[PDB]
Amino acid sequence: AEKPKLHYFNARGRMESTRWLLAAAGVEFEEKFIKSAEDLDKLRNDGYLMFQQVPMVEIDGMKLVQTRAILNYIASKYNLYGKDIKERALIDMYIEGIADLGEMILLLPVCPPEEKDAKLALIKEKIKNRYFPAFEKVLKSHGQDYLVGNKLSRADIHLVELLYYVEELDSSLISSFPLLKALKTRISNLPTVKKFLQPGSPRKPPMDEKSLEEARKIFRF
Amino acid sequence: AEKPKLHYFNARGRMESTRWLLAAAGVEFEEKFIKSAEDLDKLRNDGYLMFQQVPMVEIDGMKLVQTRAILNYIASKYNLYGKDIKERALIDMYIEGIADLGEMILLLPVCPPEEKDAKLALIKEKIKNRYFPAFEKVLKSHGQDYLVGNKLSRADIHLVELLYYVEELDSSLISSFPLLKALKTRISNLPTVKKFLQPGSPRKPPMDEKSLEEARKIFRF
Ligand SMILES: COc1ccc(CSC[C@H](NC(=O)CCCN)C(=O)NCC(=O)O)cc1
Numbered sequence: 001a002e003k004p005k006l007h008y009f010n011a012r013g014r015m016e017s018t019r020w021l022l023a024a025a026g027v028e029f030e031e032k033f034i035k036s037a038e039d040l041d042k043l044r045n046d047g048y049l050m051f052q053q054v055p056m057v058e059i060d061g062m063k064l065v066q067t068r069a070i071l072n073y074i075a076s077k078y079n080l081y082g083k084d085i086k087e088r089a090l091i092d093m094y095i096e097g098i099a100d101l102g103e104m105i106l107l108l109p110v111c112p113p114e115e116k117d118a119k120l121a122l123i124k125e126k127i128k129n130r131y132f133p134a135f136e137k138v139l140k141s142h143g144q145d146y147l148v149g150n151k152l153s154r155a156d157i158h159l160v161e162l163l164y165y166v167e168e169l170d171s172s173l174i175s176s177f178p179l180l181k182a183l184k185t186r187i188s189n190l191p192t193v194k195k196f197l198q199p200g201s202p203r204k205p206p207m208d209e210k211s212l213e214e215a216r217k218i219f220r221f
Numbered sequence: 222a223e224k225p226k227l228h229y230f231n232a233r234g235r236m237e238s239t240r241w242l243l244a245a246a247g248v249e250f251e252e253k254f255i256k257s258a259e260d261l262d263k264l265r266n267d268g269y270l271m272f273q274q275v276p277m278v279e280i281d282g283m284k285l286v287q288t289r290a291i292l293n294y295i296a297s298k299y300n301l302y303g304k305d306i307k308e309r310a311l312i313d314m315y316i317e318g319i320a321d322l323g324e325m326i327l328l329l330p331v332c333p334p335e336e337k338d339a340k341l342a343l344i345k346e347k348i349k350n351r352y353f354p355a356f357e358k359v360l361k362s363h364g365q366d367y368l369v370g371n372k373l374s375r376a377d378i379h380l381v382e383l384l385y386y387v388e389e390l391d392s393s394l395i396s397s398f399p400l401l402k403a404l405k406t407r408i409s410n411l412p413t414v415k416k417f418l419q420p421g422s423p424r425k426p427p428m429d430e431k432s433l434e435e436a437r438k439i440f441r442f
């Protein structure tokens with residue numbers, strides 16, 4: 001066959017959820033790091049990018065852009081997208097809420113500086129009052145180890161990734177959600193995830209000021 | 222099975238793409254209009270909104286929130302999500318680019334007054350240089366009447382819907398893109414879509430200042 005090839009810059013950004021999903025599925029991948037605007041232009045000029053943007057993933061003869069297109073494909077291929085159309089609907093509903101919260105956290109450092117205090121507070125309010133309660137409620141309702149179908153799915157993976165980012169933001173926020181804490185523990189002990197969490201995997205660190213500036217350069221924003 | 226029931230306010234907003242897809246599929250549906258913050262609060266209190274937000278669609282016993290979850294389910298249910306995983310990947314890539322552009326357009330009236338003109342100019346540059354070229358290129362690649370698999374899919378529907386919104390912004394934007402023009406025409410003449418475009422359907426008008434203010438009251442922004 002061949003290893004999926006992930007085109008992005010050397011940072012979490014919009015590619016990190018794909019790294020998590022592939023790693024969780026046990027799929028070895030290669031990365032080709034964009035180091036400059038000229039590298040990105042080369043991808044564009046070569047016809048690699050449908051909308052002149054990355055992430056792009058080379059997989060199974062396709063050149064897929066758009067995070068959701070990439071993740072949907074990987075999830076379906078590796079049986080992490082539930083068993084039927086109704087389980088998929090629960091998965092999609094859950095992971096779109098996850099993606100909303102993740103997007104708020106992702107973009108926080110590019111908030112206008114004058115807006116940062118209020119928005120961080122609103123993110124924390126939403127975690128405590130909206131998102132964490134929603135997921136805790138799902139887990140409490142069925143009492144099962146996984147979010148959907150009593151079986152590992154992408155929803156468990158995407159959620160637990162987000163829990164690591166929320167921990168980085170403020171380690172107290174999960175304190176009143178024992179079922180989310182338990183899910184974090186369980187999923188982090190699955191062999192593929194536990195390996196990804198260990199030093200040496202493709203897992204990327206928090207984006208520092210420098211890495212963000214590098215993004216600003218490469219992507220012209 | 223129940224008739225799908227769409228919960229939203231009486232406007233396009235985030236529910237319009239669902240109205241388009243159900244109508245195109247020939248699926249009869251009902252709408253219950255949120256008229257006040259109090260109506261929204263009742264749906265929230267009563268447990269029907271996973272993330273305390275609408276759109277919400279009651280379909281097949283589910284209370285589905287998140288537009289992409291709703292659309293993914295409807296598309297699968299009505300054979301508008303292609304015929305295999307690789308077709309779904311093209312569809313997803315295409316409709317995510319459509320959603321990106323649609324989101325820019327949706328949010329224009331909520332731009333700070335002094336940023337709006339520049340935002341519109343940027344949207345127009347993206348239409349002409351990024352998005353319309355990408356979709357024209359797809360249509361020219363196979364020369365067929367539909368974007369994917371030589372068969373109607375959700376991609377054709379979401380795209381043509383967007384072409385109507387672009388027309389409202391500036392009827393000149395499509396002028397250099399004859400294949401998109403022709404898709405607009407053909408999809409608009411499909412019996413179901415034709416009927417949806419005619420008066421007295423659930424299709425919603427452009428949101429005016431009065432409807433935007435109602436949104437501000439109901440959703441408290
Ligand atoms: C907060 O950290 C980051 C770092 C990088 C990015 C940009 S990701 C690269 C970008 N892709 C997209 O915006 C795709 C979104 C599709 N829904 C990109 O390629 N930008 C170049 C461009 O748009 O011209 C965002 C936040």
Ligand SMILES: COc1ccc(CSC[C@H](NC(=O)CCCN)C(=O)NCC(=O)O)cc1
Pocket residue numbers: 100234235273274275276287288327328330331428436440
């Ligand atoms: C430009 O016109 C509009 C009109 C209404 C809306 C808001 S749609 C209702 C809103 N839902 C969401 O934001 C869902 C997004 C999930 N990806 C909502 O229910 N707001 C209430 C709240 O968030 O508390 C946005 C632009």
Ligand SMILES: [Cl-]
Pocket residue numbers: 014054055065066067068
């Ligand atoms: Cl993306």
Ligand SMILES: [Cl-]
Pocket residue numbers: 235275276286287288289
């Ligand atoms: Cl939504």
